[PDB]
Amino acid sequence: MVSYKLTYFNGRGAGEVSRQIFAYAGQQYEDNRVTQEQWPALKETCAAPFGQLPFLEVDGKKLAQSHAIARFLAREFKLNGKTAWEEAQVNSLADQYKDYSSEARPYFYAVMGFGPGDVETLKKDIFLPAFEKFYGFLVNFLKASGSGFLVGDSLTWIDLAIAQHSADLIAKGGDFSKFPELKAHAEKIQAIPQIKKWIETRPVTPF
Amino acid sequence: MVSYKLTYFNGRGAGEVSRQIFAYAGQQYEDNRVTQEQWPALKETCAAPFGQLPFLEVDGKKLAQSHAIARFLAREFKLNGKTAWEEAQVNSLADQYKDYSSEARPYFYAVMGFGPGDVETLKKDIFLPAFEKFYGFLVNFLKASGSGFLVGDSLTWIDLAIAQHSADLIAKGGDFSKFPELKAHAEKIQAIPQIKKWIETRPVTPF
Ligand SMILES: N[C@@H](CCC(=O)N[C@@H](CS)C(=O)NCC(=O)O)C(=O)O
Ligand SMILES: N[C@@H](CCC(=O)N[C@@H](CS)C(=O)NCC(=O)O)C(=O)O
């Protein structure tokens, strides 16, 4: 019927939330994964609206930007929030999640390989202050909603994105003593059957 | 009888687009501009959801994050796109605009007196490459829409935001030789009567 194709690198990363949205919705899509080695020719192809991944094609029309794609798909499948106000709070938290990711990027770059710096020092000087600030806000949202979801009484795509990040940190030995609520959040979201099923079946990748 | 209150600094900055959405719509709101002397105080207060401005109050309920606010307000006033696909595209460009703003930030901060470094050097090494990349994407959007607006055939909030950025850069001595299209766009959007009136009456601030 409507045809979806998601183009991203062969990894979870910024595409993953859109894949998880499709899984919850039970929507068929083409998971187009591009390798490091293939990217140059695709980039020269001018396919990507801003020269970057991910991008989504909906009946061949192109949409860039990870969060624009996630919001677009979540609104189609009723995962963006149950009222206008909830949609906006979801957006607020997702944008604050972007600011966390910018603050933490020097650490994640050194850890992954892509950048310079001593990892122990960046952990304490850059990652932990960023993580503690942002996760304190997550806990505020959990307490406000009172449901176990970040916004309102049901699942939204920011739950999926945040649960995936938390799961990744935990798997690498991250200490959640300050935020046991987010450990519980990550377990809760990743047990939702459609999501558990996707996690069990997706390609295994380092990121 | 929904009551709106916008809290931001005494400047255009990240609050301005919301003020312009309200001006376009003819919607009364409280334009709450915070002084250096109030701020530390309001910050200590946990008034702001994430400790930062802007935030919007809607019958007393708080919403943070400049883009989340603009999107919430634009959707209430039909300035976010006329179809779900236009709303996504507005979202995609607005997010690329955030990426540009992040790349240019070292320069903007130096000019504003918030950050280190030599303005002349930052202008050419950091700002101009960012500006030229992003404004080339703006031209692609204008050519695709075919109407003089960035997305589709009528005004959206990203027109307001981009026109105001362009008008500021031009006013302050910027060279738009490479992008005559965006100077025309700025002139068109800033001549809209509600907008022209707001520009002539708002507090005059450097930023
Ligand atoms: N604001 C963007 C960032 C996009 C982005 O940084 N993409 C990277 C992911 S590795 C990329 O495609 N880099 C390859 C390149 O710029 O050639 C988004 O959220 O989708
Ligand atoms: N992602 C943000 C950033 C908000 C922001 O950086 N606010 C600055 C504006 S000057 C601020 O409130 N700084 C004062 C402070 O952090 O105490 C948004 O778009 O609203």
Coordinates of C-alpha atoms and ligand atoms in Angstrom, one line a residue:
Chain A
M1 CA 0.0 0.0 0.0
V2 CA 2.1 3.1 1.2
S3 CA 5.7 2.1 0.7
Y4 CA 8.4 3.0 3.3
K5 CA 12.1 2.7 2.9
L6 CA 14.6 3.7 5.6
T7 CA 18.1 4.4 4.6
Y8 CA 20.7 4.4 7.3
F9 CA 24.1 3.0 8.2
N10 CA 24.4 -0.7 9.2
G11 CA 23.9 0.0 12.9
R12 CA 21.2 1.0 15.4
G13 CA 22.3 4.6 16.0
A14 CA 19.9 7.4 14.8
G15 CA 17.8 5.1 12.6
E16 CA 16.9 2.7 15.3
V17 CA 14.0 4.6 16.8
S18 CA 12.2 4.7 13.4
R19 CA 12.7 0.9 13.1
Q20 CA 11.2 0.5 16.5
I21 CA 8.3 2.7 15.6
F22 CA 7.7 0.5 12.5
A23 CA 7.9 -2.7 14.7
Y24 CA 5.4 -1.4 17.2
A25 CA 3.0 -0.4 14.5
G26 CA 3.4 -3.7 12.7
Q27 CA 4.3 -1.7 9.5
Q28 CA 6.3 -3.3 6.8
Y29 CA 9.2 -1.3 5.5
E30 CA 12.5 -1.7 3.7
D31 CA 15.4 -1.5 6.1
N32 CA 18.1 -0.2 3.7
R33 CA 21.5 -0.4 5.5
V34 CA 24.6 1.1 3.9
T35 CA 28.1 0.2 4.7
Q36 CA 31.0 2.5 5.5
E37 CA 32.5 1.6 2.1
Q38 CA 29.3 2.1 0.1
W39 CA 28.5 5.6 1.6
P40 CA 30.8 7.7 -0.6
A41 CA 28.9 6.7 -3.9
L42 CA 25.5 7.1 -2.3
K43 CA 26.5 10.5 -1.0
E44 CA 27.7 11.6 -4.5
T45 CA 24.4 10.3 -5.7
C46 CA 22.7 13.4 -4.1
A47 CA 20.0 11.1 -2.7
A48 CA 20.2 12.5 0.9
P49 CA 18.5 15.9 1.2
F50 CA 21.2 17.3 3.4
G51 CA 24.0 14.9 2.3
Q52 CA 23.5 12.7 5.5
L53 CA 21.7 9.7 7.0
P54 CA 19.2 8.7 7.9
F55 CA 16.6 9.5 5.3
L56 CA 13.2 8.0 4.8
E57 CA 11.3 7.5 1.4
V58 CA 7.6 7.4 1.5
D59 CA 6.3 6.4 -1.9
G60 CA 9.6 7.6 -3.2
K61 CA 9.5 11.1 -1.5
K62 CA 12.5 11.8 0.7
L63 CA 12.5 13.1 4.3
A64 CA 15.8 13.7 6.2
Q65 CA 16.6 14.4 9.8
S66 CA 16.3 11.6 12.4
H67 CA 13.8 13.3 14.7
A68 CA 11.7 14.7 11.8
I69 CA 11.4 11.1 10.5
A70 CA 10.6 9.7 13.9
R71 CA 8.0 12.3 14.6
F72 CA 6.4 11.9 11.1
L73 CA 6.2 8.1 11.6
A74 CA 5.1 8.4 15.2
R75 CA 2.2 10.7 14.2
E76 CA 1.1 8.3 11.5
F77 CA 1.0 5.4 14.0
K78 CA -0.2 7.3 17.0
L79 CA 3.1 7.1 18.9
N80 CA 3.8 10.9 19.2
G81 CA 1.5 11.6 22.1
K82 CA -2.3 11.4 22.8
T83 CA -3.0 15.1 22.9
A84 CA -1.4 18.2 21.2
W85 CA 0.1 19.0 24.6
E86 CA 1.6 15.5 24.9
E87 CA 3.0 15.8 21.4
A88 CA 4.7 19.0 22.4
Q89 CA 6.2 17.5 25.6
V90 CA 7.5 14.6 23.6
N91 CA 9.1 17.1 21.3
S92 CA 10.5 19.0 24.3
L93 CA 12.2 16.0 25.8
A94 CA 13.5 14.8 22.4
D95 CA 15.1 18.1 21.8
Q96 CA 16.6 18.1 25.3
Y97 CA 17.9 14.6 24.4
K98 CA 19.6 16.2 21.4
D99 CA 21.3 18.7 23.7
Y100 CA 22.5 15.8 25.9
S101 CA 23.9 14.1 22.9
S102 CA 25.8 17.2 21.8
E103 CA 27.2 17.7 25.4
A104 CA 28.4 14.1 25.5
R105 CA 29.7 13.7 22.0
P106 CA 33.4 14.2 22.8
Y107 CA 33.2 11.1 25.1
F108 CA 31.2 8.9 22.9
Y109 CA 33.6 9.8 20.0
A110 CA 36.7 8.8 22.0
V111 CA 35.0 5.6 23.3
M112 CA 33.8 4.5 19.8
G113 CA 37.1 5.5 18.1
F114 CA 36.1 8.5 15.9
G115 CA 37.8 11.3 18.0
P116 CA 40.6 12.3 20.3
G117 CA 41.0 12.3 24.1
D118 CA 41.6 10.2 27.1
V119 CA 38.5 8.2 27.8
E120 CA 38.7 8.1 31.6
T121 CA 39.2 11.8 31.8
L122 CA 36.3 12.6 29.3
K123 CA 34.1 10.2 31.3
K124 CA 34.4 12.2 34.4
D125 CA 34.7 15.7 33.0
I126 CA 32.2 15.5 30.1
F127 CA 30.0 12.4 30.1
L128 CA 29.0 12.1 33.7
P129 CA 27.9 15.7 34.2
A130 CA 25.9 15.5 31.0
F131 CA 24.4 12.1 31.9
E132 CA 23.5 13.2 35.4
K133 CA 21.9 16.4 34.3
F134 CA 19.8 14.8 31.5
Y135 CA 18.8 11.7 33.5
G136 CA 17.7 13.9 36.4
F137 CA 15.3 15.5 33.9
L138 CA 14.1 12.0 32.7
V139 CA 13.3 11.2 36.3
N140 CA 11.3 14.4 36.5
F141 CA 9.2 13.4 33.5
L142 CA 8.6 9.8 34.9
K143 CA 7.4 11.2 38.1
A144 CA 5.1 13.7 36.4
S145 CA 3.5 11.2 34.2
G146 CA 3.1 8.6 37.0
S147 CA 2.7 5.8 34.6
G148 CA 6.1 4.3 33.9
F149 CA 6.2 6.1 30.5
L150 CA 8.0 9.4 30.0
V151 CA 5.0 11.3 28.6
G152 CA 1.4 10.5 29.5
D153 CA -0.1 7.1 30.2
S154 CA 1.1 5.2 27.1
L155 CA 4.1 4.5 25.0
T156 CA 5.6 7.3 22.8
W157 CA 8.7 7.2 20.6
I158 CA 10.8 9.0 23.1
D159 CA 10.4 6.0 25.4
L160 CA 11.8 3.9 22.6
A161 CA 14.8 6.1 22.0
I162 CA 15.6 6.6 25.7
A163 CA 15.1 2.9 26.5
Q164 CA 17.6 2.0 23.7
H165 CA 20.2 4.5 25.0
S166 CA 19.8 3.3 28.5
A167 CA 20.1 -0.4 27.5
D168 CA 23.3 0.4 25.6
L169 CA 24.8 2.2 28.6
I170 CA 23.8 -0.6 30.9
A171 CA 25.2 -3.3 28.6
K172 CA 28.5 -1.6 28.7
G173 CA 28.5 -1.6 32.5
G174 CA 27.0 1.8 33.1
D175 CA 26.1 2.6 36.7
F176 CA 22.4 3.5 37.2
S177 CA 22.6 3.9 41.0
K178 CA 21.5 7.5 40.7
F179 CA 18.7 6.7 38.3
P180 CA 17.2 3.3 39.1
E181 CA 13.9 4.6 37.5
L182 CA 15.6 4.6 34.1
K183 CA 16.8 1.0 34.5
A184 CA 13.2 0.0 35.3
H185 CA 12.1 2.2 32.3
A186 CA 14.5 0.5 29.9
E187 CA 13.3 -3.0 31.0
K188 CA 9.7 -2.0 30.7
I189 CA 9.9 -0.6 27.2
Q190 CA 12.1 -3.4 25.9
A191 CA 9.7 -6.1 27.2
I192 CA 6.8 -4.7 25.1
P193 CA 6.3 -7.7 22.8
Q194 CA 6.8 -6.0 19.4
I195 CA 9.9 -4.3 20.7
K196 CA 11.3 -7.5 22.4
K197 CA 10.6 -9.4 19.2
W198 CA 12.5 -6.7 17.1
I199 CA 15.5 -6.7 19.5
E200 CA 15.6 -10.6 19.2
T201 CA 15.6 -10.4 15.4
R202 CA 17.4 -7.2 14.3
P203 CA 20.9 -7.5 12.9
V204 CA 23.5 -7.6 15.7
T205 CA 25.8 -4.6 15.3
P206 CA 28.3 -2.8 17.6
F207 CA 26.3 0.4 17.5
Chain B
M1 CA -9.9 31.4 27.2
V2 CA -6.3 29.8 27.0
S3 CA -3.7 32.1 28.6
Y4 CA -0.2 32.3 27.0
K5 CA 3.0 33.5 28.7
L6 CA 6.4 33.3 27.0
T7 CA 9.5 33.7 29.2
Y8 CA 12.8 34.5 27.5
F9 CA 15.6 37.0 27.7
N10 CA 15.3 40.6 26.5
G11 CA 16.3 39.8 22.9
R12 CA 15.2 38.1 19.8
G13 CA 17.2 35.0 20.0
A14 CA 15.4 31.7 20.3
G15 CA 12.1 33.2 21.6
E16 CA 11.5 35.4 18.7
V17 CA 9.9 32.9 16.4
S18 CA 7.2 32.2 19.0
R19 CA 6.6 35.9 19.4
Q20 CA 6.2 36.2 15.6
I21 CA 3.8 33.2 15.5
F22 CA 1.7 35.0 18.0
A23 CA 1.9 38.3 16.1
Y24 CA 0.9 36.5 12.8
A25 CA -2.1 35.0 14.5
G26 CA -3.1 38.1 16.3
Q27 CA -2.9 36.1 19.6
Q28 CA -2.5 37.9 22.9
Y29 CA 0.2 36.6 25.1
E30 CA 2.4 37.9 28.0
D31 CA 5.9 38.6 26.6
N32 CA 7.9 38.0 29.8
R33 CA 11.4 39.2 29.3
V34 CA 13.9 38.3 31.9
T35 CA 16.6 40.5 33.2
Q36 CA 20.1 39.3 34.3
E37 CA 19.0 40.3 37.9
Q38 CA 15.9 38.0 37.8
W39 CA 17.5 35.0 36.0
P40 CA 19.8 33.2 38.6
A41 CA 16.8 33.7 40.8
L42 CA 14.3 32.1 38.4
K43 CA 16.9 29.5 37.6
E44 CA 17.4 28.6 41.3
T45 CA 13.6 28.2 41.4
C46 CA 13.5 25.2 38.9
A47 CA 11.0 27.4 37.1
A48 CA 12.3 26.2 33.7
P49 CA 11.8 22.5 32.9
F50 CA 15.4 22.1 31.8
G51 CA 16.8 25.1 33.6
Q52 CA 16.9 27.2 30.5
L53 CA 14.9 29.7 28.4
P54 CA 12.7 29.9 26.5
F55 CA 9.7 28.3 28.1
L56 CA 6.1 28.8 27.4
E57 CA 3.3 28.6 30.0
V58 CA -0.2 27.5 28.7
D59 CA -2.7 28.1 31.5
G60 CA 0.2 27.8 33.9
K61 CA 1.6 24.5 32.4
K62 CA 5.2 24.7 31.3
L63 CA 6.7 23.8 27.9
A64 CA 10.4 24.1 27.2
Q65 CA 12.6 23.9 24.1
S66 CA 12.5 26.7 21.4
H67 CA 11.5 24.3 18.5
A68 CA 9.0 22.4 20.6
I69 CA 7.3 25.7 21.5
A70 CA 7.3 27.0 18.0
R71 CA 5.9 23.7 16.7
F72 CA 3.2 23.5 19.3
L73 CA 2.1 27.1 18.6
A74 CA 2.4 26.7 14.8
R75 CA 0.2 23.7 14.9
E76 CA -2.5 25.5 16.9
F77 CA -2.4 28.3 14.3
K78 CA -2.0 26.2 11.1
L79 CA 1.6 27.5 10.5
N80 CA 3.4 24.1 10.7
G81 CA 2.5 22.8 7.2
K82 CA -0.9 22.2 5.5
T83 CA -0.4 18.4 5.3
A84 CA 1.4 15.8 7.4
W85 CA 4.1 15.7 4.8
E86 CA 4.6 19.5 4.8
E87 CA 4.8 19.4 8.7
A88 CA 7.6 16.8 8.5
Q89 CA 9.5 18.8 5.9
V90 CA 9.2 22.0 8.0
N91 CA 10.5 19.8 10.9
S92 CA 13.4 18.5 8.6
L93 CA 14.5 22.0 7.7
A94 CA 14.2 23.4 11.2
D95 CA 16.4 20.5 12.5
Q96 CA 19.0 21.2 9.8
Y97 CA 18.8 24.8 11.0
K98 CA 19.6 23.6 14.5
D99 CA 22.7 21.8 13.0
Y100 CA 23.8 25.0 11.3
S101 CA 23.3 27.0 14.4
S102 CA 25.4 24.4 16.3
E103 CA 28.2 24.7 13.8
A104 CA 28.1 28.5 13.8
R105 CA 27.8 28.8 17.6
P106 CA 31.6 29.5 18.3
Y107 CA 31.3 32.6 16.0
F108 CA 27.9 33.8 17.3
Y109 CA 29.1 33.4 20.9
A110 CA 32.3 35.4 20.2
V111 CA 30.3 38.3 18.6
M112 CA 27.9 38.3 21.5
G113 CA 30.8 38.3 24.0
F114 CA 30.0 34.9 25.5
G115 CA 32.9 33.0 24.1
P116 CA 36.6 33.1 23.4
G117 CA 38.4 33.5 20.1
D118 CA 39.1 36.0 17.4
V119 CA 36.0 37.2 15.7
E120 CA 37.6 37.7 12.3
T121 CA 39.1 34.3 12.3
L122 CA 36.0 32.5 13.5
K123 CA 34.0 34.4 10.9
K124 CA 36.0 32.9 8.0
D125 CA 37.1 29.5 9.4
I126 CA 33.8 28.5 11.1
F127 CA 30.9 30.7 10.3
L128 CA 31.1 31.2 6.6
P129 CA 31.5 27.5 5.7
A130 CA 28.5 26.7 7.9
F131 CA 26.4 29.6 6.4
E132 CA 27.3 28.7 2.8
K133 CA 26.4 25.0 3.3
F134 CA 23.1 25.7 5.0
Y135 CA 22.0 28.6 2.8
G136 CA 22.6 26.3 -0.2
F137 CA 20.1 23.9 1.3
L138 CA 17.6 26.8 1.8
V139 CA 17.8 27.6 -1.9
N140 CA 17.1 24.0 -2.8
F141 CA 13.9 24.2 -0.6
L142 CA 12.8 27.5 -2.2
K143 CA 13.3 26.0 -5.7
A144 CA 11.4 22.9 -4.8
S145 CA 8.5 24.8 -3.3
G146 CA 8.2 27.1 -6.3
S147 CA 6.2 29.7 -4.3
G148 CA 8.6 32.0 -2.5
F149 CA 8.1 30.1 0.8
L150 CA 10.4 27.4 2.1
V151 CA 7.8 24.7 2.4
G152 CA 4.8 24.5 0.1
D153 CA 2.6 27.5 -1.1
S154 CA 2.1 29.5 2.1
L155 CA 3.8 30.7 5.3
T156 CA 5.1 28.3 7.8
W157 CA 7.1 29.1 11.0
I158 CA 10.4 28.1 9.5
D159 CA 9.9 31.0 7.0
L160 CA 9.6 33.3 10.1
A161 CA 12.7 31.9 11.7
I162 CA 14.8 31.9 8.6
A163 CA 13.7 35.4 7.5
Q164 CA 14.5 36.8 10.9
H165 CA 18.0 35.2 10.8
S166 CA 18.6 36.5 7.3
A167 CA 17.4 40.0 8.2
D168 CA 19.7 40.1 11.2
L169 CA 22.8 38.9 9.2
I170 CA 22.0 41.5 6.4
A171 CA 21.3 44.3 8.9
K172 CA 24.6 43.7 10.7
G173 CA 26.7 43.8 7.5
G174 CA 26.5 40.3 6.1
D175 CA 27.1 39.6 2.4
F176 CA 24.3 37.8 0.6
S177 CA 25.9 37.9 -2.8
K178 CA 25.8 34.1 -3.0
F179 CA 22.2 33.9 -1.9
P180 CA 20.0 36.6 -3.5
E181 CA 17.1 34.2 -3.1
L182 CA 17.3 34.4 0.7
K183 CA 17.5 38.2 0.8
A184 CA 14.3 38.2 -1.4
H185 CA 12.7 35.6 1.0
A186 CA 13.6 37.8 4.0
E187 CA 12.1 40.9 2.4
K188 CA 8.9 39.0 1.5
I189 CA 8.3 37.4 4.9
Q190 CA 9.2 40.6 6.8
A191 CA 6.7 42.7 4.7
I192 CA 3.8 40.5 5.9
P193 CA 1.7 43.1 7.7
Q194 CA 1.5 41.5 11.2
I195 CA 5.2 40.8 10.9
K196 CA 6.2 44.3 9.7
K197 CA 4.2 45.8 12.5
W198 CA 5.9 43.5 15.1
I199 CA 9.3 44.4 13.8
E200 CA 8.5 48.1 14.0
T201 CA 7.2 47.8 17.6
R202 CA 9.2 45.1 19.5
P203 CA 12.0 46.2 21.8
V204 CA 15.2 47.0 19.9
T205 CA 17.9 44.7 21.1
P206 CA 21.4 43.7 19.6
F207 CA 20.5 40.0 19.5
Ligands
LIG1 N1 20.7 16.2 12.7 C1 21.1 15.0 12.0 C2 22.5 14.6 12.0 C3 22.7 13.7 10.8 C4 24.1 13.1 10.8 O1 25.0 13.7 11.6 N2 24.4 12.0 10.0 C5 25.7 11.4 10.0 C6 25.5 10.0 10.7 S1 27.1 9.2 10.7 C7 26.2 11.2 8.6 O2 25.4 10.8 7.6 N3 27.5 11.4 8.3 C8 28.1 11.1 7.1 C9 28.4 12.3 6.2 O3 28.1 13.6 6.7 O4 28.9 12.1 5.0 C10 20.1 14.0 12.2 O5 19.5 13.8 13.4 O6 19.6 13.1 11.3
LIG2 N1 17.9 23.5 23.0 C1 17.6 24.8 23.5 C2 18.6 25.6 24.2 C3 18.1 26.6 25.3 C4 19.2 27.5 25.8 O1 20.5 27.2 25.4 N2 19.0 28.5 26.6 C5 20.0 29.5 26.9 C6 19.6 30.7 26.1 S1 20.7 32.1 26.4 C7 20.0 29.7 28.4 O2 18.7 29.8 28.9 N3 21.0 29.9 29.1 C8 21.0 30.4 30.5 C9 21.4 29.2 31.4 O3 21.6 28.0 30.8 O4 21.4 29.3 32.7 C10 16.4 25.4 23.0 O5 16.3 25.5 21.7 O6 15.5 26.1 23.7

